[PDB]
Design an enzyme around this catalytic site. Structure first.
Site, PDB file in Angstrom:
ATOM      1  N   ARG A  81     -11.311  13.597  21.775  1.00  0.00           N
ATOM      2  CA  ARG A  81     -11.013  14.664  22.720  1.00  0.00           C
ATOM      3  C   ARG A  81      -9.594  15.190  22.522  1.00  0.00           C
ATOM      4  O   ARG A  81      -9.359  16.407  22.594  1.00  0.00           O
ATOM      5  CB  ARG A  81     -11.215  14.167  24.152  1.00  0.00           C
ATOM      6  CG  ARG A  81     -12.614  13.636  24.339  1.00  0.00           C
ATOM      7  CD  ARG A  81     -12.815  12.993  25.694  1.00  0.00           C
ATOM      8  NE  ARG A  81     -12.492  13.916  26.766  1.00  0.00           N
ATOM      9  CZ  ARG A  81     -11.584  13.655  27.693  1.00  0.00           C
ATOM     10  NH1 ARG A  81     -10.944  12.489  27.655  1.00  0.00           N
ATOM     11  NH2 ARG A  81     -11.326  14.540  28.657  1.00  0.00           N
ATOM     12  N   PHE A  86     -23.250  30.461  33.349  1.00  0.00           N
ATOM     13  CA  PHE A  86     -23.068  30.783  31.931  1.00  0.00           C
ATOM     14  C   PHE A  86     -23.982  29.981  31.007  1.00  0.00           C
ATOM     15  O   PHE A  86     -23.919  30.156  29.779  1.00  0.00           O
ATOM     16  CB  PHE A  86     -21.612  30.531  31.533  1.00  0.00           C
ATOM     17  CG  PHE A  86     -21.151  29.109  31.782  1.00  0.00           C
ATOM     18  CD1 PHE A  86     -21.472  28.095  30.899  1.00  0.00           C
ATOM     19  CD2 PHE A  86     -20.394  28.800  32.903  1.00  0.00           C
ATOM     20  CE1 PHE A  86     -21.039  26.785  31.117  1.00  0.00           C
ATOM     21  CE2 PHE A  86     -19.945  27.483  33.139  1.00  0.00           C
ATOM     22  CZ  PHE A  86     -20.267  26.482  32.251  1.00  0.00           C
ATOM     23  N   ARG A  99      -8.377  23.130  18.317  1.00  0.00           N
ATOM     24  CA  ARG A  99      -8.461  24.416  19.016  1.00  0.00           C
ATOM     25  C   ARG A  99      -7.104  25.094  19.122  1.00  0.00           C
ATOM     26  O   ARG A  99      -7.040  26.331  19.136  1.00  0.00           O
ATOM     27  CB  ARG A  99      -9.091  24.252  20.395  1.00  0.00           C
ATOM     28  CG  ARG A  99     -10.596  23.882  20.292  1.00  0.00           C
ATOM     29  CD  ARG A  99     -11.066  23.246  21.560  1.00  0.00           C
ATOM     30  NE  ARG A  99     -12.483  22.898  21.532  1.00  0.00           N
ATOM     31  CZ  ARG A  99     -13.036  22.024  22.361  1.00  0.00           C
ATOM     32  NH1 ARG A  99     -12.272  21.391  23.255  1.00  0.00           N
ATOM     33  NH2 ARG A  99     -14.339  21.766  22.297  1.00  0.00           N
ATOM     34  N   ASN A 114     -14.693  28.203  20.406  1.00  0.00           N
ATOM     35  CA  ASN A 114     -13.698  27.151  20.235  1.00  0.00           C
ATOM     36  C   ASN A 114     -14.141  26.099  19.222  1.00  0.00           C
ATOM     37  O   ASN A 114     -13.739  24.925  19.314  1.00  0.00           O
ATOM     38  CB  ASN A 114     -13.318  26.534  21.598  1.00  0.00           C
ATOM     39  CG  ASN A 114     -14.461  25.778  22.264  1.00  0.00           C
ATOM     40  OD1 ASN A 114     -15.594  25.717  21.754  1.00  0.00           O
ATOM     41  ND2 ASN A 114     -14.159  25.195  23.443  1.00  0.00           N
ATOM     42  N   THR A 162     -10.224  22.353  26.213  1.00  0.00           N
ATOM     43  CA  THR A 162     -11.355  23.280  26.118  1.00  0.00           C
ATOM     44  C   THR A 162     -10.881  24.712  25.910  1.00  0.00           C
ATOM     45  O   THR A 162     -11.379  25.434  25.032  1.00  0.00           O
ATOM     46  CB  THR A 162     -12.199  23.198  27.386  1.00  0.00           C
ATOM     47  OG1 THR A 162     -12.586  21.835  27.584  1.00  0.00           O
ATOM     48  CG2 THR A 162     -13.433  24.087  27.277  1.00  0.00           C
ATOM     49  N   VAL A 187     -12.110  30.601  24.662  1.00  0.00           N
ATOM     50  CA  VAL A 187     -12.866  29.404  25.037  1.00  0.00           C
ATOM     51  C   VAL A 187     -14.329  29.507  24.595  1.00  0.00           C
ATOM     52  O   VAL A 187     -14.951  28.499  24.264  1.00  0.00           O
ATOM     53  CB  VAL A 187     -12.730  29.130  26.555  1.00  0.00           C
ATOM     54  CG1 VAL A 187     -13.276  30.298  27.387  1.00  0.00           C
ATOM     55  CG2 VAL A 187     -13.454  27.814  26.903  1.00  0.00           C
ATOM     56  N   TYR A 231     -26.755  20.212  26.749  1.00  0.00           N
ATOM     57  CA  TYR A 231     -25.902  20.720  27.815  1.00  0.00           C
ATOM     58  C   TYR A 231     -26.511  20.552  29.205  1.00  0.00           C
ATOM     59  O   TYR A 231     -26.216  21.361  30.087  1.00  0.00           O
ATOM     60  CB  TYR A 231     -25.594  22.197  27.577  1.00  0.00           C
ATOM     61  CG  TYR A 231     -24.680  22.475  26.404  1.00  0.00           C
ATOM     62  CD1 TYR A 231     -23.376  21.974  26.361  1.00  0.00           C
ATOM     63  CD2 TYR A 231     -25.104  23.266  25.349  1.00  0.00           C
ATOM     64  CE1 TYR A 231     -22.524  22.263  25.286  1.00  0.00           C
ATOM     65  CE2 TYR A 231     -24.258  23.534  24.259  1.00  0.00           C
ATOM     66  CZ  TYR A 231     -22.984  23.039  24.245  1.00  0.00           C
ATOM     67  OH  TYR A 231     -22.145  23.336  23.179  1.00  0.00           O
ATOM     68  N   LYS A 238     -19.536  24.190  15.787  1.00  0.00           N
ATOM     69  CA  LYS A 238     -20.327  25.240  16.455  1.00  0.00           C
ATOM     70  C   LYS A 238     -20.539  26.400  15.493  1.00  0.00           C
ATOM     71  O   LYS A 238     -19.986  26.391  14.403  1.00  0.00           O
ATOM     72  CB  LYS A 238     -19.597  25.686  17.721  1.00  0.00           C
ATOM     73  CG  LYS A 238     -19.338  24.535  18.682  1.00  0.00           C
ATOM     74  CD  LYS A 238     -18.626  25.075  19.987  1.00  0.00           C
ATOM     75  CE  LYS A 238     -18.507  24.009  21.069  1.00  0.00           C
ATOM     76  NZ  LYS A 238     -18.071  24.599  22.387  1.00  0.00           N
TER      77      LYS A 238
END
Lengths: 150, 150, 150, 150, 150, 150
Positions: free
Chosen positions: B86, B58, B103, B113, B92, B110, B50, B10
């Site tokens: 995962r 959000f 993380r 992350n 998360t 969050v 998404y 990200k």
């Protein structure tokens, strides 16, 4: 005891260049290396090592795989080293292993899970004596001893 | 499958210099990199990525943040790579993440992350094809294959 | 410039799981990743990439090897990144490479030396534009910029 | 050869928990471990190991020190492993060793410099056969072989 | 708050060369160091630090041990730093600590568990002010702030 | 001496989260931390620290930069620690620094080169006493002492 556990890098851990990494995880926890060797393990030795599994369907395949390339048996000494060894290795199944463990960091398949470790103190004493003669077990006094246990 | 998962660094992972670290965690577990690129992701792409979140309060803020700096989408291949991905990324919420996870090691919030990972094989196939054309997916035979799975 | 260099993980670096490691060495020096992709490089592309070597006996063998498995071209940005890139990669010949360099840490053979890096700013500009279209080069402002250069 | 070198972790490297680190530096360069053991080395063995130094003032003190705690002899195999071994270990004197080398990273005193390595191929063959019987030298085909040398 | 926690490397962590490692685990999670010092902690200070334990049988032995060699108190700042600090340190008992945590990676004995960390925000504020005067607490604006929290 | 050197993480090393890394490089070489603190260094202190440079054009700019954010002065003890400190830090100019050194690994600009280190034993004694009162210098006997020097 002094408490000791048996750790063995399996043929895939040798191929993938993970011998030093396994050793370093025990050393940085203050555990003492007391024996190590590289060998081609024979079918007869491996059948005795895995004698608790001799009744199971996958035993012949496991014994052939474990003799298909060199292994690195070794012995570590220190407080709670058997139970801490099992935690450091991670769940048998890599997908159930937490990151930070050897199998959680490096493995994706239960049949290629890099390293073996004793599951109990009774197993550890048996396995140590099966793979090493008493003359191969070295003894020394760790200088940091006063700072690793009370 | 061969099983594949979609991983994306990200904008905060790019800024903080963690791209190589994310990649290395998959490589050292024997997973094969099969695609990667750096891009400015568009609002339209991110809304589709998404789409399961489009009804939530959000979502607009998430889409704007995810287009506020470059990202690094990528694809990894190997046994159990979706579920292991995962676990390797961690919860998360960073404060629920165990150390050893990405993380848990690097994140405190969050909303920052560092990395995205597919949550299911159905999501992974959708996300891989959304971000990469088939011509970008490379195929090769990993030499260590016999030692990473049985 | 801003100064930029072209770095490429070669097929052996991909096989040996060293992509993230190469990237991390540039990131931890504060360099900005501005482009990356994984591809099967064609003979025609590689002949142009290595055009300075086209007269030499080993050129056909080099071009065939460099197309024998996927590669990871990439572009890094920052002060003195071309000359520092060459130092970080190490001598062409691994046995002349100092430890701490990529080839000194990981390589034993000049024909399997993991990674390519531009040797001059003129070469870097040529190679960047040969492997990447302008739309693939991402731009962002690094938050740590005031602390990595004066 | 195949070319091989003899590496030995000295008593201080054992005490300081650096055995795995020495091994890992060779493994990550693609070198094959072919023998290893932990032992208390006898005065007679060490006098033969260091026979080139038997005329020098410091020889008795060196032999007594090298038998004062366990050591870990080992053997590595691969291209240019003798000369690369010497570079990876660093200058005999730590203060002349470059960082990135074992002695430059870990040592401050020439008499506590953690690790021994053969200085020539003739020395390596002699030392390997002095410390290991032929039955202790394991042979296997490294899966990554096509990617570590040409 | 800004939220802050008190971390202290204990005498065994100093002896074993783990001060930088403890610090680095907080830094790589984006936490800000705001105070640090090395000192010989007095009996009176340690009795106040551990005042919640003053009724317990092991308190005199703990206070004497914690004054038996230098310690490194320090203060970290960031989101959820108290609860994340406790997770990063691991269970009090090393054998209950997951790998990836400081005590799971480095410790084998609860009485030599390397590092102390505040257990609550109320404890953290008390401990910070007990060990540091306000003039020792430094303030700065972290450049990566926009990328570590939202 | 015992020989001691003064090391200081500069404002950019604090911002970039490299304090623990600098410390760890000295610890893993067996050097003893004997003092450390985080502070905002005043103009008057920095003018005295850099008094050898007071005649030079860049001195006012250097003094203002070195007071623009917190620094971490510290003191290390051991054999050859001054000359080894300079080697471990690397050339003043990062582009002349070998990889494996702090500046070769992390820096790209001479004005943002992360860390200061004494250049001579006379400078080290002066700088230690300038930044630390005698009561801040801690003394302890390192358990591994017999294994780090002869």
């Amino acid at each position: 005891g002094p408490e000791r556990t048996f750790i063995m890098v399996k043929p895939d851990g040798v191929q993938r260049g993970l011998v030093g990494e396994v050793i370093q995880r025990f050393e940085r926890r203050g555990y003492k290396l007391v024996a190590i060797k590289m060998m081609h393990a024979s079918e007869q030795l491996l059948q005795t090592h895995y004698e608790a599994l001799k009744s199971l369907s996958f035993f012949p395949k496991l014994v052939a795989y474990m003799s298909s390339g060199p292994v690195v048996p070794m012995v570590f000494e220190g407080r709670k080293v058997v139970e801490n060894g099992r935690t450091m290795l991670g769940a048998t199944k890599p997908e159930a292993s937490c990151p930070g463990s050897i199998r959680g960091d490096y493995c994706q398949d239960v049949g290629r899970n890099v390293v073996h470790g004793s599951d109990s103190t009774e197993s550890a004493n048996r396995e140590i004596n099966l793979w090493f003669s008493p003359q191969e077990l070295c003894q020394y006094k760790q200088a940091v001893d006063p700072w690793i246990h009370e």
